[PDB]
Amino acid sequence: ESAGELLVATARTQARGEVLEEVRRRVREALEALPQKPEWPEVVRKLALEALEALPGAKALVANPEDLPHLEALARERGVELQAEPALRLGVRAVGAEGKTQVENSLLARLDRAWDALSSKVAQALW
């Protein structure tokens, strides 16, 4: 006779899961819509300057073809070589001095790495 409470709890949990999935879809759309906004050229600059300093020494920098026009200047300023990659999207990648180590700074990876930490915060604030 107490299975009704179990059904209520399961329904609440599934509703919360669906809400979080909707939030994830909205965040994905907002992140993938970045290339159409004026903050985007500064965001890629920030990512490039962070990537080139995470590695103590960078042999070359790999950038998306649409992103390199906004970062060629500090590509020459830092003194590292510039390399293009059509496959790289929503960020830039750096290559270490010895060629063994590379660091990636794409926004999708950042979302994947940070959503499991901020899910509790967004749930607490939303509800």
Partner 1 sequence: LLKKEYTGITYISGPLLFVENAKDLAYGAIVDIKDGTGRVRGGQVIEVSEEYAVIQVFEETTGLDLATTSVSLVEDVARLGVSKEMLGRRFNGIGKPIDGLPPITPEKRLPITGLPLNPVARRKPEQFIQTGISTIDVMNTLVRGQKLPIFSGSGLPANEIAAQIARQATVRPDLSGEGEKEEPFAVVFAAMGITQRELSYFIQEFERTGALSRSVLFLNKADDPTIERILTPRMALTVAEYLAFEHDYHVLVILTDMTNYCEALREIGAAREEIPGRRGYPGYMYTDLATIYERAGVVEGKKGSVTQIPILSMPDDDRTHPIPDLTGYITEGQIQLSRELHRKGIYPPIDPLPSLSRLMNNGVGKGKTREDHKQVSDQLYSAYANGVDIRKLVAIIGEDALTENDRRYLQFADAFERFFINQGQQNRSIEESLQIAWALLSMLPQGELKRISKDHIGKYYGQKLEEI
Partner 2 sequence: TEALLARYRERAEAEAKAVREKAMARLDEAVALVLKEVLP
- Residue 79 CA to residue 36 CA, distance in Å, equals 29
- Residue 42 CA to residue 46 CA, distance in Å, equals 6
Choice from 8, 17, 26, 69 touching partner 1 (CB under 8 A): 17
**Using rule CB under 8 A, residue 78 touches partner 1:** no
Choice from 39, 79, 113, 125 touching partner 1 (CB under 8 A): 113
Residue tagged 């939030």 (tokens) = 23
- Stretch near partner 2 under the rule CB under 8 A, chosen from 1-9, 64-72, 75-83, 96-104: 1-9
- Answer with the entry of partner 2, partner 1, none that 28 interacts with (C-beta below 5 to 8 A by kind): none
Residue 124 structure tokens: 């607490």
Quick one: which of 13, 53, 50, 26 has its CA closest to 115? 26
Choice from 103, 107, 111, 115 touching partner 1 (CB under 8 A): 103
